[PDB]
Amino acid sequence: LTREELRQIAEEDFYEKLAASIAPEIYGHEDVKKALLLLLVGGVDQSPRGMKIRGNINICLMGDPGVAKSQLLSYIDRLAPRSQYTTGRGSALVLADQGVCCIDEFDKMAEADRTAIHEVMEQQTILNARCSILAAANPAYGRYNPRRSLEQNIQLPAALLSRFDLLWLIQDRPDRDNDLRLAQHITYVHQHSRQPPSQFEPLDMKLMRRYIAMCREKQPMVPESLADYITAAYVEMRREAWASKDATYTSARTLLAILRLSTALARLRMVDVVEKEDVNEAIRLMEMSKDSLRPADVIFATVRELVSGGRSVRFSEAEQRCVSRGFTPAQFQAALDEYEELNVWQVNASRTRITFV
C-alpha cells in the first residue's frame, strides 16, 4: 500500500470497520464477517520437528435457505485475490492454491468426493492443495431442527465437521422488529443503489485486498508467557465440551484452530508477537461459534480456619488473626455474638476460650 492509505485504514475501531467492510449489503452477522476476515488473513504455517501444521482457516456456514449465504460466498470470491467459487454438482482445489476455495451446496454432494475432501482438509495436499476451504450447507429437511442432533441435521460425518475449524449456524428466527429492520434496509439498498448510511464508509475492495496481502507477509512468533494461560483456557473448554454430550469433539484440532486464530489476529494488527488480546478474541469467537449451535461471614471463616483438629479456640489468637485481616475488634465482637446466636458455639464467661458446639 501507500502508507497514507494504511493510515486511512488505521483509525479508531479499525477492526470493527474492517469487519463491517466485508459484505456490508447484508445486515448483521458481524461475527461471520470477522470469521471471513480472519479466513482472508489466515494463520501461520510451521514445520517443527518433522511434522507440518496448517495455518489455513476452513469455515463451514450452515443455515436455512434465504439467509444470504450465496451472496456472502460471491462477495468473498470477488474480494479474495485467489478464489475459486464452485457448487456441489458443478465440480478446482488445485486452481485455488494459496487462495480460498468457496464451495456451496456441500450437503448436496455424494460421499465419494467427500472422502477425498478429508485428505485436502488434513494435509492441504492431493499435488499441493494449500487452500482455505469455505463451505456452505443447508438442513436436510429445509429447516434446521434443534430437536435432532447436529450430525443428523447436517448428514455429514463428525470427523468432517471437526476438521472445519469454525462452524457457524444461521437460523431464520422470526422477530417482528428485526424483520422490519431487515425489510427497510433491503428497501433502501434497492431504491438508493447503495448500502444504508452506517457510521463509517466501508473501505474499497482493492484497498482491503492490498491490506490483506501485506498482513499475510508477517509471521508472528508465539511468546512462551501466554502458553500457560492458553493451556488453562483449552482445559476449561475441553472440560466443558466433555460435560456436554452434544458439543463437538474438542481434540487437538480445536487448540490448533485457536492458535491459528490468534496468529491471524496478530497478523491483522501487524505485530510480530501475539498478545493476550488476540487469545481472548479467539476464545470469544470460538465461544460465539459454539453458542450458535458481611464481616460476620468473613470472621466466621477466619475462626473456622483455626479449627484444624481442635474443638476449642483461644480468644486472643482469633482476635489477632481477625485484626490482621483488616477488621476492627468491634466488628469481631459483633460477628462473634451473631454466630453465637445461631447456637454454633459458646464463649467462655472469661472471654479466654471458645468451645465450638
Binding site: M51, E122, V235, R238, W242
Partner: protein, 308 residues
C-alpha cells in the same frame, strides 16, 4: 557387506547397553506421547521372526511375520503413526478401505498385474479404516493372513502368488465411542476368524483424566536424530545376519504359559505368535539363543494387551 567394521563396532556398543530397547522405544515416533507399549510392539514387528523351511516335515511354510491391529476413535495418532511407519520402512505400503487381469494389446493374451499386497512382498502393508471395508476383500484377507499365499481361479486363470507381508490395520468402533461392554466384537463387530488371526490387538482409548489432557496440550504446544538413521541399518543388519533359536527353558516356559492361558478362556495360533514375539525380542538383544527374558517379556506384553 554394506557396513564397515566401525559401524558393526558401534552397533555392538549400542546393543551392550541394557536400555537400548527402551531407548529405541523412545526413538520411534518422537511426536507420539505415552504409547510406549505400541512403540515396543512396532519395533518387535520390524524385527519380526525368523524364517524356517519345513519341507522335510511335509508341512506348509509357517508364517513368520507379525501383524498388529489398532482400534480407537478417529483423529488419534492412527494416521500419523501409519504414515511414519510407511515413510520409515523401505518397501512399505499405505492403503485405505489384489492381482488383476490385463489384456495384452500385442498378443491378445491375458496377463496378470500385481496389487499393492503382492508389491509389498517382504515389506509392511498398512491399512486405515479396517471396519469400513467390503466383506469380499476381508474374506480374501484370511488366506494372506494365514498362509501368506494367494490363489486365484477366475475365467480359466489359475495362479498362486507369494504374499509375504505384515498387516498393520487401524479400525474404528461401530459406536464411534467406547460403549461399556465386554467383548471387542460388541464395539467393533468383527468375526472371530480375523481377530484370531491377528497376533497383537491394541485399543486406543482417550481417557477422561485431566492430567492426560494437560500433558497432551503441552506436548502439542511444545511440538533422537542419532537413533533412527542408525536404526534403519541396524534393523537391516539384524534381519540379514542373526537368527535366534529356541531352548529347553523357553520350551518349558511357553508350555506353562499356554496351559495357564487356556484357563482364562485359547488357540495354538497365539502360542505361535508368542514364539514369534520371543524370536523378535531375541533379535532385539542380538542374541542367537532365545532365553527366559524374551518369553517373559512377550508374555508380559500379551497379558498387558489383554488386560487393557
Amino acid at each position: 557387506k554394506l557396513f564397515s567394521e566401525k559401524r558393526v563396532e558401534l552397533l555392538k556398543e549400542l546393543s551392550r547397553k541394557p536400555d537400548i530397547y527402551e531407548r529405541l522405544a523412545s526413538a520411534l515416533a518422537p511426536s507420539i506421547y505415552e504409547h510406549e507399549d505400541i512403540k515396543k510392539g512396532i519395533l518387535l514387528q520390524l524385527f519380526g521372526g525368523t524364517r524356517k523351511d519345513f519341507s522335510h516335515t511335509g508341512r506348509g511354510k509357517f508364517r513368520a511375520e507379525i501383524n498388529i491391529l489398532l482400534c480407537g476413535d478417529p483423529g488419534t495418532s492412527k494416521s500419523q503413526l501409519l504414515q511414519y511407519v510407511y515413510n520409515l520402512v523401505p518397501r512399505g505400503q499405505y492403503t485405505s478401505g489384489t492381482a488383476y487381469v490385463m489384456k495384452d494389446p500385442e498378443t491378445r493374451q491375458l496377463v496378470l498385474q500385481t496389487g499393492a499386497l503382492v508389491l509389498s512382498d517382504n515389506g509392511i502393508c498398512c491399512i486405515d479404516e479396517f471396519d469400513k471395508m467390503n466383506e469380499s476383500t476381508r474374506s480374501v484377507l484370511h488366506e494372506v493372513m494365514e498362509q501368506q499365499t494367494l490363489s486365484i481361479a477366475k475365467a480359466g486363470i489359475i495362479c498362486q502368488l507369494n504374499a509375504r507381508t505384515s498387516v498393520l490395520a487401524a479400525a474404528n468402533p461401530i459406536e464411534s465411542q467406547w460403549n461399556p461392554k465386554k467383548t471387542t466384537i460388541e464395539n467393533i463387530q468383527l468375526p472371530h476368524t480375523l481377530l484370531s488371526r491377528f497376533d497383537l490387538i491394541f485399543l486406543m482409548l482417550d481417557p477422561q483424566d485431566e492430567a492426560y489432557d494437560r500433558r497432551l496440550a503441552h506436548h502439542l504446544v511444545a511440538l533422537e536424530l542419532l537413533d533412527m538413521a542408525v536404526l534403519k541399518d541396524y534393523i537391516a543388519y539384524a534381519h540379514s545376519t542373526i537368527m535366534p533359536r529356541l531352548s529347553e527353558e523357553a520350551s518349558q516356559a511357553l508350555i506353562e504359559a499356554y496351559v495357564d492361558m487356556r484357563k482364562i478362556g485359547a488357540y495354538p495360533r497365539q502360542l505361535e505368535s508368542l514364539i514369534r514375539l520371543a524370536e523378535a525380542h531375541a533379535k532385539v538383544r542380538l542374541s542367537n539363543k532365545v532365553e527366559a527374558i524374551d518369553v517373559e517379556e512377550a508374555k508380559r506384553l500379551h497379558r498387558e494387551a489383554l488386560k487393557q
